[PDB]
Amino acid sequence: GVGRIICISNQKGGVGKTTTAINLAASLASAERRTLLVDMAPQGNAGSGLGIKQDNITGTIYEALLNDRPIQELLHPTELRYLQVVPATPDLTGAEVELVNQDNREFRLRDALRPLAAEYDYIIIDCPPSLGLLTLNALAAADSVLIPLQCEYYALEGLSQLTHTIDLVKQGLNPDLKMEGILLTMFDSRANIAHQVVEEVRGYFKKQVFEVIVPRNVRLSECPSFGKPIILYDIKSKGCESYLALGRELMKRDT
Amino acid sequence: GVGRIICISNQKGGVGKTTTAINLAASLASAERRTLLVDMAPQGNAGSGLGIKQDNITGTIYEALLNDRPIQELLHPTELRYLQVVPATPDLTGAEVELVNQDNREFRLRDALRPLAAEYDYIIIDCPPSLGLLTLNALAAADSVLIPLQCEYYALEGLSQLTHTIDLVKQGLNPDLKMEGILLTMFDSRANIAHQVVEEVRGYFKKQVFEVIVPRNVRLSECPSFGKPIILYDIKSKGCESYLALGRELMK
Ligand SMILES: Nc1ncnc2c1ncn2[C@@H]1O[C@H](COP(=O)(O)OP(=O)(O)OP(=O)(O)O)[C@@H](O)[C@H]1O
Ligand SMILES: Nc1ncnc2c1ncn2[C@@H]1O[C@H](COP(=O)(O)OP(=O)(O)OP(=O)(O)O)[C@@H](O)[C@H]1O
Ligand SMILES: [Mg+2]
Ligand SMILES: [Mg+2]
């Protein structure tokens, strides 16, 4: 009766982690899958893109990671009945430093999500652009990791270090961690490197790469400024189509 | 004759920090200003975009942060005589954990790097998308901070947290730290919000915002795959022109 915990990870900055976390979560919630979106990035963009931002640590994931507060007390409503959010704080930067000298440092999120595991169908964890303790808590809590891979050079160059870190995680912190898949993002057919990224990544990772590609689409960058996922901003747009298709692929794997 | 140390900082991921670091540095070096580019990001994109990439720690800034190695030993040549690089390692991820329990952890870069201003006109530090100990080292070492601001909503939303954190560094770690300027980047003139970001940022920060705006430009995203700054890849590109103009703006 337990749902699936998926972390959205890539230490390269600006590759579509949060756009993916928000729009995947909203797609699932629109299909009446109970979905929780947990923002583990100090920047707090997953919460902000859904109209949620907290003035201090109260009501944020920080309280569950360091202060033993039940995550049940930290659920925030959204415009979708089946989507709740646990938001971040910039104080998560300090939390990562505080956790270095604490016990069970990598399992704070894993342990905090236990009281909810069978209350949600999906728990989506948005990661910051880093491989530090916030991202490691996400990877240690997740059943699977979904890698958004921007179709540009620096993102491609960093993929090996990300998969190496996932392999290290499977050697101890979380042996059961599975690759949900690599999602090609921010694709632009006019850029010849974009085509090379698609070919190389599909060539090597094959069925670990999602069939759907997320195109560069200005509507995806507009909707967070209105605090809306793309399905509530411009449902016709190709970007919203891409994330609905991703949602359908994941829900197939749970039928 | 003492050079200027400029930190390129923005905790938002993917706003043009590295593209600015590389291409500002290469513009300055092309004008025969002695320039050193230090990569403080575990991703190591600043070095990679200039043809310098490695996984191991030897020769990287790791050794100056944790092993007391002089930065003078870590200088790597580029295709520009006046541009050297001190590269990163992915093991800076582990370094940032190790720094937590190090005496004077915030000043490791300052103590090792400030002396090199006697030998360089400009020292440019590329920061990772974070406000943790690597970025704080860069801010505590610098004379000034240059903020690249992508003309999209999340980057704008992050600006007040960034300036708040820079103020906190100024008050507690580096009282002389100055604003080099805000650089509007990745600007798409056909995007309504891009114009709104420009207008809001110029309205609040006024002349602290550079006149030059870096436009979205496909060649700027291509040249790192060849290990080349845009001045050595497509000098006929408006991306190249923007960063040459930025260099002229500073050199003034
Ligand atoms: N497919 C897309 N088309 C157009 N713009 C996009 C697309 N995906 C993301 N963006 C925009 O590009 C920027 C970077 O995306 P986003 O913030 O989701 O990346 P991220 O990996 O979460 O970044 P960070 O490393 O800061 O967490 C944002 O301003 C976002 O709105
Ligand atoms: N003006 C531009 N036009 C087009 N592409 C650009 C431009 N500036 C940067 N890019 C590309 O956008 C991506 C993000 O830029 P870049 O990596 O320089 O940002 P960053 O802030 O250094 O990222 P990170 O947070 O990961 O350090 C890269 O693939 C880069 O090549
Ligand atoms: Mg994000
Ligand atoms: Mg960078």
Residue numbers in the entry:
A (entry chain A): 20 to 274
B (entry chain B): 20 to 271
Question: Can I see the authors' text?
Answer:
We demonstrate that the N-terminal ParA-binding motif of ParB associates with a conserved bipartite binding pocket at the ParA dimer interface, in a manner dependent on ParB clamp closure. Moreover, we show that ParB and non-specific DNA interact cooperatively with ParA and synergistically induce structural changes in its Walker A and Walker B motifs that correlate with the activation of ParA ATPase activity.
However, X-ray analysis revealed that all crystals lacked the peptide and only contained the ParA21-274-D60A•ATP dimer. The structure of the ParA21-274 dimer in these high-confidence models is similar to the crystal structure of the ParA21-274-D60A•ATP dimer complex (RMSD of 0.527 Å for 242 paired Cα atoms), supporting the general validity of the modeling approach. When associated with ATP, two monomers interact face-to-face, with the nucleotides sandwiched in between the two subunits. In the case of ParA, ATP-bound homodimers have non-specific DNA-binding activity, mediated by clusters of positively charged residues that line the edge of the subunit interface. A combination of computational modeling, nuclear magnetic resonance (NMR) spectroscopy and mutational studies reveals that ParB interacts with a conserved hydrophobic pocket at the edge of the ParA dimer interface that is formed by residues from both subunits and includes a loop immediately adjacent to the deviant Walker A motif of ParA. The ParA dimer contains two ParB-binding sites located face-to-face on opposite sides of the dimer interface. However, there was a noticeable increase in HDX in a region at the catalytic site of ParA comprising the Walker B motif and an adjacent loop that reaches up to the ParB-binding site and contains the essential ParB-interacting residues L150 and L152.
